[PDB]
Amino acid sequence: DQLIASVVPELLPSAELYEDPPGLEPLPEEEPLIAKSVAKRRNEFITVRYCARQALSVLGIPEVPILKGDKGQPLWPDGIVGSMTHTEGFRGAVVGRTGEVRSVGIDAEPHDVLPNGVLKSIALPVERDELDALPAGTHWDRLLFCAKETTYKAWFPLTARWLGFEDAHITIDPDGTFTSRILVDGRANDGTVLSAFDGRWIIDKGLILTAIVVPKL
Ligand SMILES: CCNC(=N)NC(=O)Nc1c(CC)cccc1CC
Ligand SMILES: [Mn+2]
Ligand SMILES: [Mn+2]
């Protein structure tokens, strides 16, 4: 019944918590990253890393700090890829080994309409027309935004480059899948070319969860 486990393969352990349990602490090496942060930010940072460390233990990796790189990206141990996300009512993480998968991204959002003006900032004109044609009963605008965030999180670890909202065209299928088509240069750091990603999505517990796994070559 866990949301991340429903949209990623069994080979990628995941862990999620819906509240901030009492008594958690960051590892000493992580404390400087949130020393001057408000309580809401300290709590999501600490709880998501407790989830990541649980998933890393399933891979046989013991307790390790998860620091942030120059573009805010989490810095995983050698031979590990992963992703983390937090929203009100959700903290989650997923990790995998580089010999099984190339990259993973996840994102969680509340299942509600986007705030005013956000859809115009994140969607291509063609995506807006596509969302209007989808069946009634799902907040397609919020699902599109969620899928764009997951696209960036799967892309950045492979390219080390920015990806704007206008740089990817996402097509959502009501069956719980989506595709992301990259509209800019897709040269990856390993010499290969990224052009498209396949994603999965689920709506449950008032939340939307999207995931992309970039598979082994
Ligand atoms: C496909 C285009 N999507 C993105 N480029 N998305 C992000 O940059 N998202 C983001 C933002 C901007 C909303 C701020 C802080 C941290 C992150 C990284 C998860
Ligand atoms: Mn967050
Ligand atoms: Mn997010």
Numbering used by the authors: 5 to 221
Show me the paper's own sentences about this structure.
Despite the absence of inhibition on M. abscessus growth, and since 8918 was able to inhibit ACP conversion in our in vitro assay, we wanted to confirm binding to PptAb using X-ray crystallography. Crystals of PptAb prepared in the presence of CoA and Mn2+ were soaked in a 5 mM solution of 8918 and the structure of the complex was solved at 1.40 Å. Interestingly, binding of compound 8918 to PptAb displays the same pattern as that observed for PptT. Three hydrogen bonds involving the catalytic base Glu153, one hydrogen bond formed with the main chain oxygen atom of Leu167, and van der Waals contacts established with Lys152, Tyr156, Lys157, Trp166, Gly168, Phe169, and CoA are found. It is noteworthy that a second 8918 molecule was found at the surface of PptT11, which is not the case for PptAb. We found that 8918 inhibits ACP conversion by PptAb at nM concentrations and that total inhibition was achieved in the µM range. The fact that the Ppant of CoA is perfectly ordered in the structure of the complex with PcpS, which is not the case for PptAb-CoA-8918 ± ACP complexes is in accordance with the finding that 8918 inhibits its target by displacing the Ppant arm, which decreases but does not abolish catalytic activity in the case of PptT11. Indeed, unlike M. tuberculosis for which the MIC90 of compound 8918 varies from 0.56 to 3 μM on clinical isolates, it has no impact on the growth of M. abscessus in broth culture at concentrations up to 128.0 μM, probably as a result of its inability to penetrate the cell envelope.
